[PDB]
């Protein structure tokens, strides 16, 4: 009576092991645990979304509104939350787009599931309700698609793709951020129209260089790569033009050393007198063949000895240090060169072409300019990013990567397949699934009708973060979808969407004029990952933890 039996036969497992089952409201506590981190990403959704500050154990601060980036530094405890954390990371890797949608959609499916479980629906019937409704959802997305990108590169068409993607990440000015990204994409495209070749694109081609100081309006696009380096012998503006011939050596420049027990052997004083002048003639003979080929610049991958740097300054040859690997690998893609390990005379067919190499002060340090020109086009262009704070420079770099990942979506599928933006995609699916829930007899219609209710979070979040009442604005939007379709074709009511601030009362007319659209390839995997993320949580009847 004084002390409990304290769960007899609990010694079967260690004291750190705990058992949590769907019974005793733990499945409700798991859903309630999602709402703790769900509201964190709700205020970050949309162009008006609010960025968040997360301080790790090392002191590094990353300010971003991206749900996939924020969940990386956070330490997660509840097991089912890690299902939602790792679900948003896959969306950022695969499509590089729609990361905040997976976080919000998978969290709302569990919120509407709390009412489904309370009514007595078993975990098996709830899973079957979302799987049957998702298959109908993916089929309706292909029916509601409007327009296409058609040609790969265009000045105007790239403003209907990258611009609406970067509008949510560091909104700021529209045309300023869109022109910087759209310029670097046109350089890495092989073009070659009418040739019938298979298009190709690399997401790691475009590199963002973070340089503090200045302003965003002072940023520009550089066709070549930009590094922070100090030339050893001399700096040269290379105003003599006629371009240049450049060679890249992944191996360092120095006398070849034996990998085992390199040692100087001198038997008599006769060999010692010629040992000092012998090493000078070796580098002279090797570097003379390079200078005879007209090579004004040499890219090195490791430390170069001083004896080798002497003869390079004699013929006026620049010296570049390219540490590690990936930094040197993208240099040859600019000039179209093939590295070779030997120090001998390079092949003229493997030599690159760079017209000018400049060194100027940007952020207070000397940077080398690899920028290319109109002719002899180059690939893997870099974008100089100027900013006052380094925290803004980090997320804009990820904001540009979101626009670069959107270019990848123009390659694998048949086209761009633009979808109505401003939340009009998830709203139209509500009326279609509602009709689909009635067409299915049985008890499975409860999970299907509530599956469309979870799509109401997109219009409510965009309206709440915009400073508008969700009770006045949201029902007024259904008035366009409540009139269904008339006796005549050509219905433009599908372009209605949610507006930020301004005059409210729905607004922005038809979004076709606003030019903001969504990607179909992004919405395909965004719904599949978010559904499986909530399905995994609902499919687990018992959760076991260790040590805590």
């Amino acid at each position: 009576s004084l002390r409990l039996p304290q769960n007899p036969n609990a010694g079967l497992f260690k004291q750190g092991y705990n058992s949590y089952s769907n019974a005793d409201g733990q499945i409700i506590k798991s859903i309630a645990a999602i709402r703790e981190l769900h509201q964190m990403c709700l205020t970050s959704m949309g162009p008006c979304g609010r960025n968040k500050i997360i301080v790790n154990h090392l002191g590094k601060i990353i300010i971003t509104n991206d749900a996939a980036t924020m969940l990386r530094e956070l330490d997660i405890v509840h097991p089912a939350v890690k299902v939602l954390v790792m679900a948003t990371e896959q969306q950022k890797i695969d499509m590089g787009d729609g990361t905040n949608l997976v976080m919000i959609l998978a969290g709302e499916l569990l919120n509407v599931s709390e009412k489904l479980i309370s009514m007595g629906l078993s975990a098996v019937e709830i899973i079957q309700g979302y799987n049957m409704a998702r298959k109908f959802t993916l089929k309706e997305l292909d029916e509601m698609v409007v327009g296409e990108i058609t040609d790969k590169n265009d000045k105007n068409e790239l403003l209907k793709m990258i611009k609406p993607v970067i509008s949510s990440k560091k909104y700021g000015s529209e045309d300023i951020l869109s022109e910087l990204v759209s310029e670097a994409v046109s350089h890495v495209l092989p073009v070659a129209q009418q040739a019938g070749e298979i298009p190709y694109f690399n997401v790691d081609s475009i590199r963002v260089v973070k340089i503090m100081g200045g302003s965003l309006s002072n940023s520009t696009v550089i066709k070549g790569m930009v590094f922070n380096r100090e030339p050893e012998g001399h700096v040269k503006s290379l105003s003599e033009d006629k371009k240049h011939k450049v060679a890249v050596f992944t191996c360092p420049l120095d006398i070849a050393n034996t990998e085992t027990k390199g040692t100087v052997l001198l038997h008599n004083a006769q060999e010692m007198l010629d040992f000092s002048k012998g090493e000078e003639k070796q580098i002279d003979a090797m570097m003379k063949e390079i200078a005879d080929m007209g090579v004004e610049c040499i890219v090195a991958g490791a430390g170069v000895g001083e004896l080798a740097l002497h003869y390079l300054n004699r013929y006026g040859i620049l010296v570049l240090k390219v540490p590690s690997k990936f930094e040197l690998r993208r240099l040859c893609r600019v000039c179209g060169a093939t590295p070779l390990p030997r120090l001998g005379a390079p092949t003229p067919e493997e030599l690159g072409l760079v017209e000018t190499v400049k060194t100027m002060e940007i952020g207070g340090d000397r940077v080398t300019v690899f920028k290319q020109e109109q002719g002899e086009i180059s690939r893997t262009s870099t974008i100089i990013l100027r900013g006052a704070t380094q925290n803004n420079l980090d997320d804009i770099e990820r904001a540009i990567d979101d626009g670069v990942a959107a270019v990848k979506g123009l390659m694998k599928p048949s086209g761009g397949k633009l979808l109505p933006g401003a939340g009009a995609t998830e709203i139209e699916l509500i009326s279609r699934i509602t009709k689909y829930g009635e067409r299915t007899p049985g008890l499975l219609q409860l999970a299907i009708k509530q599956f469309a209710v979870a799509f109401e979070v997109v219009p409510r979040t965009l309206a709440e973060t915009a400073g508008l009442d969700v009770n006045e604005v949201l029902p007024n939007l259904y008035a366009a979808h409540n009139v269904t379709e008339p006796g005549a074709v050509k219905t433009d009511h599908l372009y209605k969407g949610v507006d930020i601030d301004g005059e409210s009362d729905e607004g922005v007319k038809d979004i076709r004029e606003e030019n903001i659209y969504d990607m179909l390839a992004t919405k395909k995997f965004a719904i599949n990952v978010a559904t499986e993320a909530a399905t995994t949580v609902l499919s687990i009847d018992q959760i076991i933890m260790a040590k805590k």
Binding site: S1, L2, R3, L4, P5, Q6, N7, P8, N9, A23, D24, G25, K29
Partner: protein, 538 residues
């Protein structure tokens, strides 16, 4: 969801609390099952102070040992209430509660809900009460035969001590009632017999006395120890004043008043003593062999002891509260408070009054009465636990012989009543069901759980309970077709059956009736409790 209310709150829900009720009752039964029967084990209770208590009864064991498990507390309070009214059945109820849970727990793992299990208990218990009326045998107590009371009283003593001390105590507990009876009024009280605790002779040398015995001895040497004819005068007033209600004092002007004010307090004492002396000589003066004895509940002035010493009057002080009512029944006198009204009619009579000196204390013995309405039992022992072990054996033997006079119906013992309920509860046909397949599950669990009593008796004897009960079912099958009514018991000597009526073993009516009803409620509430919660402010 309980920790959200309080951080320190803990609970066990559904089967988590169900395993507790089955385990805690089985663990408590496993300790007390070895005490069931005449061959049962003897427990030695040793506390932190060094006291030793030997008893086979579960009432003393559960009282001295505090139970930490909340589940076994219900069984302890149920066995305690069983000992209050019936004075017997502590071990029996404990063995039934733990068995009803284990038998019902086997069906719960099969998918049976505890609600319909509790239904089978109430339906089968009501059928056992109807069978209890037909199984019991009415007896005639108007003859007051000794042989019938000796066998019933011996059956309770065989479960306490060996057969040597049982044969000594059997006529004592049979004589424990005797002259205490009423035909019309039916009132029977066992609190009139006195339990004396003293170390003298041996525990097997104790005897029964036909009259009251007191622990107070003669305060003055000249008081005669042996009195042939004594008139007991009951005085509830204190001869020695302890204090005066209204605060007062004595203020004397001269030293001559000091002895006078001291003599002022001598008048009130002599005023009460004046009427007492006149009462002795009122009957007859100068009469030898006729003494006068006073038994006082309050204290007696040591100064007044010499007043009664000259008249050879025995005085006793500091009597118990229950002793006053016993003086009217034994000596035949009447309780008196003050001395203002006296008479020979209100005085008692005793044929022999003597006192014996045991150790440093003297005990008063009164016996040889004409029609005594009460008696006493002298319990002697060779040690400390001998007084506690024999007392627990007598008190449990008192309630056994009282139910015979309270209820003329006597139920045979030796597990004959529990085995008879087994075959009766197997098939109830269409008589009482209430549901299809729901009620029959609880009845089967209650029927097989009643067989733990005969099996536990055999386990304490060192034999096989399955082989003993096997020959019991074979005899009951041939007895139904032979048109002969037979009561088959359990013999623990040769490991065979027997007849409780021939062997002399019987059980009380109130003990078995309250055991089945009491154990059913405890086991039912534990099956209906799916959560064990603990909360409060430290």
């Amino acid at each position: 969801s309980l920790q959200l209310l309080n951080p320190k709150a803990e609970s066990l829900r559904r089967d988590a609390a169900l395993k507790v009720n089955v385990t805690s009752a089985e663990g408590l039964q496993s300790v007390l099952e070895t005490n069931l029967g005449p061959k049962g084990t003897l427990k030695m209770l040793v506390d932190g102070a060094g006291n030793i208590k030997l008893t086979k009864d579960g009432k003393v064991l559960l009282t001295e040992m505090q139970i930490q498990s909340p589940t076994a507390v219900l069984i302890a309070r149920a066995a305690a209430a069983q000992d209050e009214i019936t004075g017997d059945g502590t071990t029996t109820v404990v063995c039934l509660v733990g068995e009803l849970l284990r038998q019902a727990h086997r069906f719960i793992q099969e998918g049976v809900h505890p609600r319909i299990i509790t239904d089978g208990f109430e339906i089968a218990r009501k059928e056992s009460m109807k069978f209890l009326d037909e199984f019991k045998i009415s007896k005639t107590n108007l003859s007051n035969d000794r042989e019938f009371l000796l066998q019933v009283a011996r059956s309770s003593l065989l479960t306490k001590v060996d057969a040597d001390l049982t044969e000594v105590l059997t006529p004592i507990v049979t004589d424990a009632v005797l002259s205490v009876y009423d035909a019309q009024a039916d009132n029977l009280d066992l609190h009139m017999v006195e339990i004396m605790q003293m170390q003298h002779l041996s525990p097997k040398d104790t005897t029964f006395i036909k009259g009251l015995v007191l622990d107070h001895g003669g305060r003055h040497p000249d008081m005669p120890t042996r009195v042939k004819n004594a008139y007991v005068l009951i005085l509830n007033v204190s001869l020695e004043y302890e204090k005066t209600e209204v605060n007062s004092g004595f203020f004397y002007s001269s030293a001559d008043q000091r002895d006078k004010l001291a003599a002022s307090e001598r008048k009130f004492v002599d005023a009460k003593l004046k009427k007492i002396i006149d009462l002795k000589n009122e009957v007859c003066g100068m009469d030898p062999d006729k003494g006068f004895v006073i038994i006082n509940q309050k204290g007696i002035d040591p100064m007044s002891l010499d007043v009664f010493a000259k008249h050879n009057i025995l005085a006793l002080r500091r009597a118990k509260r229950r002793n006053m009512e016993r003086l009217q029944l034994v000596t035949g006198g009447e309780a008196q408070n003050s001395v203002e009204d006296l008479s020979p009619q209100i005085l008692g009579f005793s044929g022999l009054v003597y006192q014996e000196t045991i150790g440093e204390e003297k005990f008063t013995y009164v016996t040889e009465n004409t029609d005594p309405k009460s008696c006493t039992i002298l319990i002697k022992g060779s040690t400390h636990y001998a007084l506690a072990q024999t007392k627990d054996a007598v008190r449990d033997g008192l309630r056994a012989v009282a139910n015979v006079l309270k209820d003329k119906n006597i139920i045979p013992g030796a597990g004959a009543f529990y085995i008879a309920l087994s075959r009766y509860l197997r098939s109830a046909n269409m008589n009482k069901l209430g549901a299809k397949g729901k009620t029959k599950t609880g009845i089967e669990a209650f029927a097989e759980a009643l067989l733990v009593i005969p099996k536990t008796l055999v386990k304490n004897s060192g034999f096989d309970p399955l082989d003993v009960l096997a020959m019991v079912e074979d005899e009951l099958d041939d007895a139904q077709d032979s048109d002969e009514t037979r009561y088959v018991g359990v013999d623990l000597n040769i490991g065979d059956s027997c007849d409780p009526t021939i062997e002399g073993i019987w059980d009380s009516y109130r003990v078995l009736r309250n055991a089945i009803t009491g154990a059913t409620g405890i086991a039912s509430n534990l099956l209906l409790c799916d959560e064990l919660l603990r909360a409060g402010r430290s």
